[PDB]
Each structure stands twice: as structure tokens, then as C-alpha cells.
Amino acid sequence: MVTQLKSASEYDSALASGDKLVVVDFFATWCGPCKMIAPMIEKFAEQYSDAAFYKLDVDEVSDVAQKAEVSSMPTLIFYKGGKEVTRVVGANPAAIKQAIASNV
């Protein structure tokens, strides 16, 4: 399951996980590719049980989106030990899957 982050607070606690891969999907409700990739992302969460998946609506938690420097949707950011390891800007199934598999 992909837990929606509702505040800056939730976002940050999500990140203090260490060693555990934390993956955040920055999306918008108006964003088409976001919608098309959302089912895939759920599949990936089932497969990669070693990693915690989340999503954050950029129009609800804007401050977090601006501080994470998200300027296109969807943007998947990969954290480990509270630090950004990488990110994928785009509804790119293959790149997202590889990013998860390789950083778990």
C-alpha cells in the first residue's frame, strides 16, 4: 500500500527510516501521467516489501514540494538514511522500477 503524506511532519518522520529505502511519489490530481503510473506504483509497493512507499499531493503539501525542489509531476524521490539517493522526474515505469530494485 502507498501511504499518502498529509503534512510536512508526516513527510519527515517517513524519511527518518535509515537503511530502509523510502520512495515518495510527488503527484498532482490534474496530472495525467501521474494517474497512468499510480497502479504501477502500487504493484511495485507489493513487490518491493523491503521499501516504504508514499505519495504526496503537491497542491496539498506545496511547501514540501518546493523544498524538495519538485518542478514536474510525477516525481519519485528515493531516500535512504534521511538523504535523497536519487529521483525520477516522469511517469517512466522502467526507470522507477530500476531505481527501487537497485536501492532497496
Curated annotation (Swiss-Prot):
Coiled coil: none annotated. Residues 2-104 form the Thioredoxin domain. The active site is at C31 (nucleophile), C34 (nucleophile). Keywords: Cytoplasm, Deoxyribonucleotide synthesis, Disulfide bond, Electron transport, Golgi apparatus, Isopeptide bond, Membrane, Nucleus, Phosphoprotein, Protein transport, Redox-active center, Transport, Ubl conjugation. GO terms for molecular function: disulfide oxidoreductase activity; protein-disulfide reductase activity. Induction: Strongly induced by hydrogen peroxide and diamide stress in a YAP1- and SKN7-dependent manner. Also induced by reducing stress by DTT. It is a peripheral membrane protein. It is found in: Cytoplasm; Golgi apparatus membrane; Nucleus. The modification Phosphoserine is found at S62. Belongs to the thioredoxin family. Present with 17237 molecules/cell in log phase SD medium. Yeast has two cytoplasmic thioredoxins, TRX1 and TRX2, and one mitochondrial, TRX3. Monomer. Part of the heterodimeric LMA1 complex together with the proteinase inhibitor PBI2. LMA1 binds to the ATPase SEC18. This is Thioredoxin-2. The gene is TRX2.
